A paper describes a structure:
Calcium/Calmodulin (Ca2+/CaM)-dependent serine/threonine kinases (CaMKs) constitute a family of 81 proteins in the human proteome that play a central role in cellular signaling by transmitting Ca2+ signals. Kinases in this protein family are activated through binding of Ca2+/CaM to regulatory regions that either flank the catalytic domain or are located in regulatory molecules. CaMKII proteins form large oligomeric structures. The N-terminal kinase domain is tethered via an autoinhibitory helix and a calmodulin binding site to a C-terminal oligomerization domain that organizes the enzyme into ring-shaped oligomers.
In contrast, tetradecamers were detected in the crystal structures of isolated oligomerization domains. Here we present the oligomerization domains of the human γ and δ isozymes that were refined at 2.7 and 2.8 Å resolution, respectively. The oligomerization domain formed a hexameric structure with a diameter of 120 Å and a height of 60 Å surrounding a central cavity of only 17 Å. Thus, the main consequence of the insertion of an additional subunit per ring in the tetradecameric assembly is a considerable widening of the central cavity, to about 33 Å. Each oligomerization domain in the ring also contains a deep cavity that has been suggested to represent a peptide binding site, based on structural homology with peptide-binding domains present in nuclear transport factors and scytalone dehydratase. In support of this hypothesis is the fact that a glycine or an acetate molecule, respectively, originating from the crystallization solution were partially occupying this putative binding site in the structures of the CaMKIIγ and CaMKIIδ oligomerization domains.
Numbering used by the authors:
A (entry chain M): 343 to 402, 407 to 471
B (entry chain G), L (entry chain C): 341 to 402, 407 to 471
C (entry chain I): 338 to 402, 409 to 471
D (entry chain N): 336 to 402, 408 to 471
E (entry chain H): 339 to 404, 407 to 471
F (entry chain E): 338 to 402, 408 to 471
G (entry chain F): 341 to 402, 408 to 471
H (entry chain J), K (entry chain D): 342 to 402, 408 to 471
Write the structure that this text describes.
Amino acid sequence: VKARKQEIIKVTEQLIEAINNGDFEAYTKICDPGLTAFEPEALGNLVEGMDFHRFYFENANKPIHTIILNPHVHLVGDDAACIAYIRLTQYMDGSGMPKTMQSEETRVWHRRDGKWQNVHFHRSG
Amino acid sequence: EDVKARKQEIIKVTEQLIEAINNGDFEAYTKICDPGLTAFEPEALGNLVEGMDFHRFYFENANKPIHTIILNPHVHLVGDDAACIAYIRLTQYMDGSGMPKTMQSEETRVWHRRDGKWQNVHFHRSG
Amino acid sequence: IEDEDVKARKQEIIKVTEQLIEAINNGDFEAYTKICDPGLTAFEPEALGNLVEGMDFHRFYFENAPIHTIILNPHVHLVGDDAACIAYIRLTQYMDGSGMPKTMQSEETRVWHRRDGKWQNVHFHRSG
Amino acid sequence: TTIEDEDVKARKQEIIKVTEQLIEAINNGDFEAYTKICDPGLTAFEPEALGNLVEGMDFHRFYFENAKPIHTIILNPHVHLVGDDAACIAYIRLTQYMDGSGMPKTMQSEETRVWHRRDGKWQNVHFHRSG
Amino acid sequence: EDEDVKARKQEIIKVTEQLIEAINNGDFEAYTKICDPGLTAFEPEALGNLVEGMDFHRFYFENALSNKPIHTIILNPHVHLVGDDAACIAYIRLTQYMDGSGMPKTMQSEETRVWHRRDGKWQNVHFHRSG
Amino acid sequence: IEDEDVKARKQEIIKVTEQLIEAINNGDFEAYTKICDPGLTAFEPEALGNLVEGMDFHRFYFENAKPIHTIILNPHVHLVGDDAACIAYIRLTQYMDGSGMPKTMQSEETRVWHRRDGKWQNVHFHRSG
Amino acid sequence: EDVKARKQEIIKVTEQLIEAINNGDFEAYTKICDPGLTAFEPEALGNLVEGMDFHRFYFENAKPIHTIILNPHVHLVGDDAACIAYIRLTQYMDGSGMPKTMQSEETRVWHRRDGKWQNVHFHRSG
Amino acid sequence: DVKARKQEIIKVTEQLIEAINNGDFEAYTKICDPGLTAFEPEALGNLVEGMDFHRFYFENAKPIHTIILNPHVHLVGDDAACIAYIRLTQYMDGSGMPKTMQSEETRVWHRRDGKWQNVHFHRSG
Amino acid sequence: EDEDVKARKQEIIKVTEQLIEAINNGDFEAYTKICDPGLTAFEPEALGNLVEGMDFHRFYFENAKPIHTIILNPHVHLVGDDAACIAYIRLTQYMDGSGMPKTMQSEETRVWHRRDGKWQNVHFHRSG
Amino acid sequence: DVKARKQEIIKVTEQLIEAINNGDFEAYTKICDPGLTAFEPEALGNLVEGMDFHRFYFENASNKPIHTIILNPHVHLVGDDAACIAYIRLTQYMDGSGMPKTMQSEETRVWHRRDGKWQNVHFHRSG
Amino acid sequence: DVKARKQEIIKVTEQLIEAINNGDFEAYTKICDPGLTAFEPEALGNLVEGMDFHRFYFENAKPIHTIILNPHVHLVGDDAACIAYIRLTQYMDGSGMPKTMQSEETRVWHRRDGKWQNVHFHRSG
Amino acid sequence: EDVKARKQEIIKVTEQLIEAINNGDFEAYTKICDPGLTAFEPEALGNLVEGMDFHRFYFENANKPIHTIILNPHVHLVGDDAACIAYIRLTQYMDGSGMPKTMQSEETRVWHRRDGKWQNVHFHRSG
Amino acid sequence: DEDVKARKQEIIKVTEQLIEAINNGDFEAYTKICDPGLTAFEPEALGNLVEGMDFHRFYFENALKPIHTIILNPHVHLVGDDAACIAYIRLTQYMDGSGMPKTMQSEETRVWHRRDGKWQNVHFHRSG
Amino acid sequence: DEDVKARKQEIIKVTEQLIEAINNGDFEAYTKICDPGLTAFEPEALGNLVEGMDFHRFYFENALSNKPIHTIILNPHVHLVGDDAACIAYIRLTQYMDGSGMPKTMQSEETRVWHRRDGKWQNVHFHRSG
C-alpha cells in the first residue's frame, strides 16, 4: 500500500515538473485527453480537455520550486487513485525577492496500459 | 446506454449525499461516506481534514428552506468500482434580510463502491 | 401590403412577453411554467455567471418570495414562421426599504418558439 | 426517437461551428468577414454600448477600425433549434489574452446569439453579452 | 408687439406652474389632462432611458402619498415661442421641502418642457429634467 | 399614406440633428451658427447648472478644442405644429482615450427646432450626463 | 459725529433685521426688505433669488440664539444709499445639547425710501 | 431710462472684469475706490480693505472668457448702484482642455466726479 | 532681588488661577470683574476671528460632571510695574460621555494690567 | 497720544515680520528679548524659550516672493513701557503648483520698551 | 516503538487541551511544569513565565471541539519530546452559528517521575 | 553554575545558527539542523514544513548590513541531550528608503545533541 | 551575590506595592509611596511632564471588575545606597466591555529614593 | 539652593553632551558616557527593553547622510537622588531637514538615569517615547 501510494506521489511530481519546465508534450502525455479541471484561472467554470491549458504553456530565466505538502492518497480499486495535497510554490517576485504561495490541489489518476494518467483536478487558492 | 446509466448512478448518489447534508442527517451522511474520508473545504481553513470528527460539529450545532442544484456535472468512470464527479453546487437559501439568495461552490467528489454501495472517499469544495 | 403582418406579428411577441412578465410579477409559477419551454435555458444575475437549465432554479424564487414593469424600446426579430426573439429594457418600478418609489433596469433578451399554436420562451438573458 | 438525437446533434454543431467562425472574425479584426456573417439589421446588447440596444454595423465598425495573441473558448454551449431556419446559442465566452504586466490572463462573458438561415447561410440577427 | 410676446410667454409660465402644482398635489387626473398622452421624458428616475406615455409616472403618483409641505419656484424661466401653437420653456426648478432631520432644505433641477396647443388648451409633449 | 408622411417629416428632424452634430464634431462654428437660432438657449454639463444664451458660450469650445463617431440612438420626434418640432435621443459618442483605446460615452439630449424661411433651426437644447 | 452717526444708523438697522430673522417675524422682515430684494445665499444653492417668496418658507416652517455682527464696515454711497459688510457670528445650541458658534460673511445693501432704510440686496457665504 | 442706467452699471462691471483678466492693475485701480472692501475666497473668510491685498495677485500671476450671467442691478439713488450676477469663467486646464467655473458675485458702485467706482465686492465659490 | 521677582510672578499666577476658577464655576459676575471691559480674545470657539468685549463670552456662561484645571509650566513676563503676561499649558480634567475621566489641553496666553490696585485681563489667546 | 502710541507698536510689529520674511536673524535678535517665549504650531504644543529654537528656521530656510498683511490689529497699551498687539497675519506666497495662495494665522505679541527700543518678549501664533 | 512513544505525546497533548477546554486549572497545573514559559497572542509579544498569567483566563472565562491536525512529534532523548500541530477549534459564534478557527502550536514535553509535563509552548495565530 | 553554562551552550549554538542564516551559508545551516527539521514560520503560510528543501530556495535566491539580537532568551534543559530556547529575535537592517530599521519575531527552537553536536530539530517563528 | 539580588528584590517589592495601591484605588497608600514632588511622563498627560500629586488625584477620586498586573522582565539598577531605578513591561489583565478577559501592556520606568528608611517614587515614565 | 541649582546643571550639561555625541554619530564618545549595562526603552526597540551597547551600535555604524540637526532639551526637571545618582526628564525637540527639502521639528518624551562612577557621570538607563 505504501509503495503504491508512492507511485501516485511520484507521478504527481512528474506532472508538476512538466508544468514548471513549460513542457506541453510531457504534460499532454500525463493527462487523459478528456481531463476536466476546476482552477482559479478558469474563473469558476469546469474546463475540459487540453485546449484551455495550451495557452498558458505557449505564452508563458526565473527559478521555481514546488513542494507537494502533506499528500494523502486514496487507492480506489486497482487502476484508480486520488491524491490531495498543499502545493507550495517558491518563486521570485517583481521586487527581485524570493516568495512562497500555496494552493489546495486534488488530482484523480487512472491507469491505462500501465501508465497513470490524470483525469481530473481541482485547485483552489 | 451503459456509460450514460453508470454516470447517472454517481449523480444520483451525489444527490443523496447533498440531501443528507441539507437534512442535517449525520447517520445518513455517515453511511454514504468512507470512514477515512478526506476533505478540502473553506471551513477547514486551508487544511486537509480527515474522518468524520470535523463534520459532526456542523451537523450537531446547525425551518429556513434550502434548495441545491448540481449544475453541469461531469463524471469520470475510473475502473469498475471507482468514479469521480465534478460540478457547480448552487445553493438557494433565505437571507438575513428575509429574501431569497443563491450562492455557489466548485465541488469535486471521489467515489468508491464497497459491497455494492457507492461511498464518498474524498471531496474538495472551493468558494 | 407586406408590413401589415410584420407589425402585427411583432405585437404578438410583445404581448406574450408582457404576459410572461405579468406571471412573474404575480408570482404565478403554474402560469410561468405554461409559457416556458420545459428546457428553458437562462443567463441571469441571480445564477451568478452560470447558464441554468429548466424550471428547478426559478421555482425557488416563486415559492419563497406594488410593482410595475415597463418593456421599453422593444425590438423584435421574426426568425422564420415559428420563431422570434425580442430585446428590450425592462424597467421595474417598486417600493424601497425607505418607503419610497424607485425604478431599476435590466437589459433582457428572450427567444420564443411556437409549439401547437402557443408561443413559448426557450431562452432568456438578463443583465444588470 | 433515436434518429432525431443524431439529427439534432449535427444541427447543433452547425450553430457552434458558425459561432466559432464569427468569434474568429472578431479576433482577426476582419470586418468584411464579420459583415458577411451578421444580418445588416443586427441588434446587440453589450457592455461597450453602456446599457443601450445598438442596431446595425455602424457601432461595431469603430472597434474594428481602431483596435499580443488571443484565444477564445466557447464553454458549455447550449443550442436551441427553433424551427428549420432559426437557432440560438448560449455560452460562456472565455478569452485568454496577454496583460499590461506582460502576463497571460483569462476573462469571461456570458453570451447569447440568435441565428437565422438566409439563402443557405446562417446569419447572426441579435446578440447579448454581459460581463 | 413686445406686449403681445410678454403675455404669450406668461401663458406658458402659467401653464408650467399649474403642471408642477398638479405634481406637488399628487393629482394624476390633473397631470393627465395637461400632458399629451404620448409624452416623452428624460429624468433621473428613468435612469438614462427615454420613457414614453403616462405608465411610468403613474407609479410615482399612486405610491408617493406624502403630510409634509413643499414649495416650488420656477427660477429664471426663458420661453421660446416656436410658431403659434408651440412653445418651450427652460428653467431652474427649486424645491423647498422638509428633510429627515426635521429641517427645511432646498434642492434644484434644470428642466426643459415643450408645449403644444391642441383645441385651445396647452399640453406638455416632452420634458427633460437633470439633477 | 398619412403615416408614411409623419414618418418623412420626422426624418427631416433626425437629418437636421445629424447635420448639427456633424458640424460640432468637425469644429465648424460657421456651420453651427447657421443651424442655430442666434438666441439659442442651452442647458449642458459644461454650463455648470446655468442656462446659457446665445453663441458666446459655445464659441470658446470651437475656437480652443483623433477620430470620433456619434450615434443618435432611439430618437423620438414630436411634431408640434407645421413649423416646430422637438427631438429626444441618447447621443452615443465613440472616441479614442488617453490610454490609446476606443471608448464610448453617452448623454441624454433634447433639441427644439423651429423652421424659419424654409430652414430648420435649433432654438434650445438640454444635454445631461 | 456725522459719518460715525450715519454709519451707526446702518448698523442699527442691520441689527433690527437680524433680530426679526431670529424672532421668526416675517411681517417685520417684510417691512425692512424692499419687495424686490435679491439674495445670494447657501440655501439658494448658487442661484440668485428674487422677492420674498423664497424666504417665506423658512419663516413659516422653522432653543436660544445670539447673533453678533462682527467687524462691520459701512460705506455711505450717497445720501439715500449704504452698504454694510460684516462677519455674522451665530451662537446656538447643538443636537448634542451644547453651545456652538458658526459664521458667515455677509453683505447688505440699503436704500432709504420715505425716511425708512430698506434692504435691497444681500449676499451670504459660508 | 432705468434700462439705460442699468446698462451703464453692467458696462462698467464688464470693464472691471476685463481689467482683471488683462492683469492691468493701473486700470483696476482707476475703477476701484481706494478704500474698496472685499469678501472673497482667497481672503480666507476675512474682509480685506484697500488695494494692497489684490496687488500681489496682479504682480505675480492661456486664453480666458468671462460671462456676466443673469445680472440684476439695483439703482439706489442717483450716484449709487449695486449689481449681482453669476460670473462664469471659461479657461484652459492643466490637462490641456477647456473648462468653465462659476462664482456668485455682488458689486457696489458709487459715482464720483462722473466716473462710476467700485466700493465693495463679495465673491463666493 | 529674585525673591521680589518670584513674588510678583506668583501674583500673576494667582490671579490667572482665580480667573480660571470663575470660568469653571460659571460665575460671569466674577469673570466680568477680573476682565477689562475691552478684553480682546483669540480662541477656537471664535472660529479664527478676534472678538472684543464681554458679549461673546456671556452666551457660554448663560447656557452651559466635576472639572479640574492645572496651569502647567507657567512663564510670566513682568513688563513694567503695572503690566504682565503669562503663558501656560492649560490642562483640563473632566468626565466624558462614556462616563470616564479624560484630560485635554490648550496653549494659553494672557496679558494683565493693574488698574486701581486690581490686576485685570486685557487680552488672551487660546489655541487647541 | 493714543492713536500715535498704537502706531508705534504696529510699526515695530511690521519691522519684525519683515525681518522674518527677509530671513535676517541678526535683525530678529535685536528686536526680540533674549528670553522670548513662544507658542507656535512648529513648536508642537510646547512653550519654547529663547532664540535657539528659531535659529534653525532662519539658518535652513528663497528666490520666491512673499507679502504679509497685518489685518485688523488691536493694540492694548498696558502702562508706559508695555503693549500688546493682536492681529490676523495674512501671508501671500507662491505655491508648489506655481500659483499665488494666501494663508492665515491668529497672532499675539507682547512688547516691552527697554532703553527706548521696543522688544518682543512673548508671542503666540495659532493656525 | 517510535510510533507508540509518539502516540504517548499526542495523547498527553490531547489531555492538556481537554483540561483547557474544560476550564480545569488544577488539571492544567498538574500537566504543566511550574516554570512553563509561553509565547501566545494574548501575551502580546512577550514571553510569559509560570502559571500566574494563565490563571486569570481560567478564573474569568457554548460547546467546543478541538482537533489536533497533522501532528509531528520529535523524540529528543528518552525523557524529552516536542510536538507541532495545527490546532483547529470548532465553536459557536455571536451570530449563533458554528465556526472554525486555527492556530499553529508547538509544545515541549519533559518526563519527570514517569509523568510527561509541558515545559514550553508557542502558539501563533 | 553548571546549569548556567549548559544554558549558554544553547544560546551559543542558536547564535551560530542565526549567523549562518545572515551570512547566507546553507552548508553551515545544514550542519546545524537535523535533516528532518520541522518548522512553523510566516513564509510557510500556516503549514508545517519538513526538511531542508523549503529553506534552500531562500538561501540560493537571497551586501546589506544586518544585525540580530537574541533578546531575553529563556532556555529549558529537558534531559541531558535535549534543550529548547525561546527568545525575541530583533533584526536590525537597512531599508528601501536607505535607512536603518528594526523588526521582531518570537522564536522557539528545540535542540538535540547527537554525537556531541547540538542540532536544531524544530522551530517556530511568528511575527 | 545574594545581597545585590535581595536589594533588587526590595525595589521590585515596593513597585508591586505601588501598583497594588493603584489597582485598589487607594490614594492615601499611593501618596505614602510617592515623593510629594514626583514627576511623570504618561499617556494621559498628553505629552507634558506633570508634577506632584494634583494630576493623579482626579483619576483616583473619579475611577469608581477584577484586574491583575504583572511586572514582566524587571531590570533594576542600584545607583548609590539610597537610589534605584526599575524598568519593566507592565501587563494588565482586565475585563472588557464585551464582558471578556483582555491584556494590555506598557513600558514603565520608575526611579526610587530612600528617605528615612522608606523607598519613595520620585519619577516615572509610562509609554504605550 | 546655590549647590542644588549647580548640581542640577551638571546633569543637564552631561545630558547635552550625550545628545551631542548621538547627533555627531560618535559611538566612542557615546560609549564613554554610557554604563556598559545601559538598559533602554525606545520606539526603535519595538516594545522590548534592550540591554548594553549592541543594539545602538547598528544605528551609529549605518546612519551617515551634510544634513544639519539641532536638539533642544526643553523644560528639564532633575531629581538628585543621593550624592552619586540623578535622573532627568525633558522634552527632546529635534529640528531637522525633511525629504521635501524643508525644516521640521519633532518631539519625544525622554527620561535618563545617571550614576557617577570615579567622578564621571554615566547613563545607566533611558526611556524615550514618541
